[PDB]
Structure 1
């Protein structure tokens, strides 16, 4: 835990070779008090998130952590809200630009990498701080099938079978680990969230985004659609 000079204020190397500022940005992701779970199936990919509206006057329809990047790419953000929205906007811009110059839809792994590259710059440049959010992307690849990718504040990204983010990240990973060692995929995801939250939420308590092989277009399940999986 050594420290010298301004190695805890700006993104510079500390005595042990660590980047404290980047590590602090990972703690900022848990400040929102939410947890996200993405599960990759055999022919589908689902993203479940904790929908909390503790205010009553708030318009529940405007409260969501699931965003549509492209027609076939959806994502779930975790962490600082404002930072998340800017990253979602950046991803959308990157995706549209990719198609405009290359002639085809950007692959999920390429989009995730592009966002991670941008995040890396913040860990090397001292003038600006890293974003306090986490991005999880899901989409159907035409050659590889269902895809689940996640990048963070450190600029690190990877492909996953199933992965989580948020306050109960360590607990969601332990639940999904045993399961990996459509309907089941959606169920497993919801289960993982419910298991680590101990609440068994209703249809209006969570959000669901999915992409299947048959129906590649990113979709968001409604109250009646979420309840159906909850009743079973």
Structure 2
């Protein structure tokens, strides 16, 4: 029951430690930060924005294939943080779950339902000892007819929740503090204000001035519920608007 106590194989498989913890899940949480990237999601009154940093170390790498933004359905987009192959497997699972939900129930899956399904699968990974949990974090973005923009994040522990703003990656603590400060000083957030808030959060937690090719922005709005990825021209316009002021 003491802090840091270990017994048997509690460090190697997902069984309880004397304190009642699961160390493998925490190790998967550290595997999330092993990727080295950071992503920020912010919810507006009529929009929702995900911004993640795009690192292409070498020119031999085709930049159009290094994407951490994925679309699950026409109206749902996601940003993945952590291990790349785990993130791609989870994206494929989410796409399958959404397609199956539409086939079986006759209407598009809500963002909360998809996050709940992914969290259930990751919980199953956390309870059975024969398989590794996924070292990836998923943030979902979409528009609900009744409630509006939705920001949902699920973790390897099986936990999921909705957010006004959230972050994931190496600098998620600093980004969450910055977003706490921004949200506490509550004021009307249009689409432009939400995009600038996310971009400036990423820039200030990374302490680097951004170029349009160094980040990746995806948005959903009430007017256009389809998930889309901003091109370099639109990101450049947003960056210029940020830099002038």
TM-score, normalised to structure 2, is 0.93
Output the CA distance in 2 between the equivalents of 1:200 and 1:51.
13
Q: Once the two structures are superposed, what CA deviation does each residue of 1:181-219 show, in whole Å capped at 9, x if it has no partner? A: x11100000000000001121111100100000010001
SS in 2 for 1:28: helix
Q: Deviations over 1:128-160 (max 9, x none)?
A: 010000000000001100000000000000000
Secondary structure of 1:190's partner? helix
Deviation, structure 1 residue 56:
1.1
- Give matches, 1:153-192, under 5 Å: 153-180=156-183, 182-192=191-201
Deviations 1:44-66 (A, max 9, x none): 00000010000210000000100
Distance in 1 of aligned mates of 2:83 and 2:12: 19
Quote the Cα distance in structure 2 between the aligned partners of 1:42 and 1:144.
Answer: 10
How many residue pairs get aligned? The number is 230
Q: Distance in 2 between matches of 1:105 and 1:74?
A: 13
SS of equivalent to 2:56: coil
* Cα-to-partner distance string for 1:82-109 (whole Å, 9 max, x where unaligned): 0000000000000000000000000000
Structure 2 residue runs without a partner (length 5+): 184-190, 241-245
Q: Which runs of 4+ in 1 moved over 2 A?
A: none
TM-score (norm 1): 0.99
Structural RMSD (CA):
0.4
Cα deviation for residue 165 of structure 1 reads: 0.2
